[PDB]
Structures are given as C-alpha cells and as structure tokens.
Design a protein around this motif. Sequence first.
Motif, PDB file in Angstrom:
ATOM      1  N   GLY A 125     -18.783  16.484  -5.484  1.00 61.72           N
ATOM      2  CA  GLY A 125     -18.734  15.323  -4.636  1.00 61.72           C
ATOM      3  C   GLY A 125     -18.079  15.605  -3.329  1.00 61.72           C
ATOM      4  N   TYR A 126     -18.108  16.930  -2.810  1.00 67.48           N
ATOM      5  CA  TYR A 126     -17.661  17.147  -1.430  1.00 67.48           C
ATOM      6  C   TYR A 126     -18.714  18.126  -0.744  1.00 67.48           C
ATOM      7  CZ  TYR A 126     -15.724  21.224  -3.769  1.00 67.48           C
ATOM      8  OH  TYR A 126     -15.620  22.519  -4.419  1.00 67.48           O
ATOM      9  N   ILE A 138     -16.453  13.548   0.965  1.00 69.28           N
ATOM     10  CA  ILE A 138     -17.154  12.293   0.898  1.00 69.28           C
ATOM     11  C   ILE A 138     -17.388  11.716  -0.332  1.00 69.28           C
ATOM     12  CG2 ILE A 138     -18.913  11.356   2.449  1.00 69.28           C
ATOM     13  CD1 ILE A 138     -17.038  13.068   3.899  1.00 69.28           C
ATOM     14  N   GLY A 139     -18.063  12.518  -1.093  1.00 66.31           N
ATOM     15  CA  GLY A 139     -19.064  11.967  -2.243  1.00 66.31           C
ATOM     16  C   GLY A 139     -20.350  11.648  -2.223  1.00 66.31           C
TER      17      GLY A 139
END
Lengths: 49, 68
Positions: free
Chosen positions: B14-15, B46-47
């Motif tokens: 998720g980054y 961010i995700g």
Amino acid sequence: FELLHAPATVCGPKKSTNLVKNKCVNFNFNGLTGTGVLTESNKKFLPFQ
Amino acid sequence: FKNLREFVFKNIDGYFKIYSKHTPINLVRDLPQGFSALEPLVDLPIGINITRFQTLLALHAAYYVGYL
Ligand SMILES: *[C@@H]1O[C@H](CO)[C@@H](O)[C@H](O)[C@H]1NC(C)=O
C-alpha cells in the motif's frame, strides 16, 4: 489516528535520553531494542543507511 | 543526451516506492553496459491501487520500458 500498511508518518517525538559510553546500558532506539556498550566508531555510513 | 534518468516504480504493502539515479552516458539509442546501483528511494504512504501506466510528457524524445 488512521494507520495504513505503509510505514507510519505521524509519529510522536520523545526525549532521546542522553547517551553514555563504555558502560552497559539499554540502547533502545526508534527501530532497535536491546542492551550493550555504545562507543564511538568511524564507519563510512551512507546518507540512506 | 548525456543525462540518464534511471527510475524504478513499485507498489508493495500500500505504498508507492521510487528510485532514481543521474549518470552521464555516451549512447542514446541503447542503454550501455555498466553497473551503477540506485541508492535513492522515497516512500509514498498513499494506499492507491495501481495497475496501469501512462507516461506524462510535456508537449509544446525516446525512452525504454522494462518489467521486474
Ligand atoms: C489494492 O491494494 C491493497 C493493498 O495496498 C490490496 O490488499 C488489494 O488487493 C489491492 N486491490 C487491487 C484491485 O489491486
């Protein structure tokens, strides 16, 4: 407080207890935990290491 | 074009993770042989799910695309 799988960014600052040398103390840091003797060393660390 | 802009893009956990390195070169139509590791990196927490890639280029040029 929203936490994601990504590394956290909104951290909480502490007091970075004063450091000592040549005596067995706990060397707990931001990511390290344990006890030992912390002396001065002249390694050539990289800016991202 | 002596300037080489070597980048690496990756999405894990998720980054968005990026790498870069600027190094002079001599050949422009093909990537010359040689070793130069890409130390710089910046993490973007961010995700965002990403599966498609579009090159954002300014219009009033050549590039290469590889896969890991
Ligand atoms: C989107 O990313 C999350 C983690 O960042 C992952 O669990 C999920 O499966 C991804 N979904 C898609 C459609 O890529």
